[PDB]
Amino acid sequence: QNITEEFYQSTCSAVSRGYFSALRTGWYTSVITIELSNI
Amino acid sequence: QVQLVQSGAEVKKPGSSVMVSCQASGGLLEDYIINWVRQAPGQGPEWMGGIIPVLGTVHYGPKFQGRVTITADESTDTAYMELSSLRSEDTAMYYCATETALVVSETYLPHYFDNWGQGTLVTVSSASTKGPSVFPLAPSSGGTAALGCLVKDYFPEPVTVSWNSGALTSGVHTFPAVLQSSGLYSLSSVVTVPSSSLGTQTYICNVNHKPSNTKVDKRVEPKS
């Protein structure tokens, strides 16, 4: 867990570098069932 | 506390069809699962089928489907079982057994039998119905004598016997019927009794062979 931050006085902005991505690109669908008996 | 009363034992010809009834007293047929179980001599019981009138569903055992019909007459609270094309393998005691079906969902199945009928002995044979003859077995001369009566030459089983209208039970031994070489069944019923009551006490054996409509009350006592 090594993170480096840079602050730019010219533009009053800051960039925190070193993080990694985990983007939700798709979907997985599953059908969960429960068996019932109607009285 | 509900008693299941089935139809009486009978002899049916091979190839014919038999109808057995089962009468419920104390509750409605819709309130039960009504099952039919049979037991051949020397085997365990075999479940034939069951009907659930509250759901209107009838179920048949695979061996018996297509030749067994079970119905539920809700007008009289009587269940029935009709088995057609009778043959020797069918000689067995047939039992009517119930499971309470008070709170039932759909696709409910029979699971157990907590209330039973008395059983109906169906005998498939070519022989005719014949009532038995009863003959005394008089006592004579330690301190206990024995007497009895002999129930001979009847068909089919069973024959029933009670002593003193069912009063005398401690010490009675009613032996299983024996098929004689001549055919037909025969049976003996003996009871031991103190020797001092041989003259002061009356001993009557009440023999019933319901298939033949035979009711016999035979008195036993020494002769002279």
CATH number, position B163: 2.60.40.10
- Say if CB B20 and CB B80 are below 8 A apart: yes
Instruction: Write the CA distances from B150 to B34, B99, B170, B175, B181, integer angstroms.
Output: 38, 40, 19, 10, 17
Residues B110 and B29 in one domain: yes
| Method of determination used here | X-ray
Domain boundaries, position B156: 127-220
Neighbours of B122 (CB within 10 A): 21
Last residue of a domain, one of B81, B107, B126: B126
Residues B44 and B120 in one domain: yes
B105/A contact by beta carbon, under 8 A = yes
CA B63/CA B15 separation, integer angstroms: 17
- Residue with tokens 């690109």, as numbered in its chain: A25
Give me B115's structure tokens: 């209330």
Q: How far is B102 from chain A (nearest CA, A)?
A: 11
CA B93/CA B140 separation, integer angstroms: 39
What residues of chain B, 1 to 60, have a C-beta less than 8 Å from chain A? none
b/e for B35-62, b at 16 or more Cβ within 10 A? bbbbeeeeeeeebbbbbbbbeeebbbee
| Resolution in units of Å | 4.3
Residues B121 and B135 in one domain: no
Residues B22 and B74 in one domain: yes
Residues B101 and B25 in one domain: yes
Closest CA relative to residue B216, chosen from B202, B224, B205, B203: B205
Residues B214 and B140 in one domain: yes
CA B56/CA B208 separation, integer angstroms: 39
Residues B11 and B30 in one domain: yes
Residues recorded for chain A: 39
Residues B107 and B131 in one domain: no
Q: How far is B52 from chain A (nearest CA, A)?
A: 15
Largest CA distance in chain A: 74
- Say if CB B4 and CB B58 are below 8 A apart: no
How many domains does the structure of chain B reveal? 2
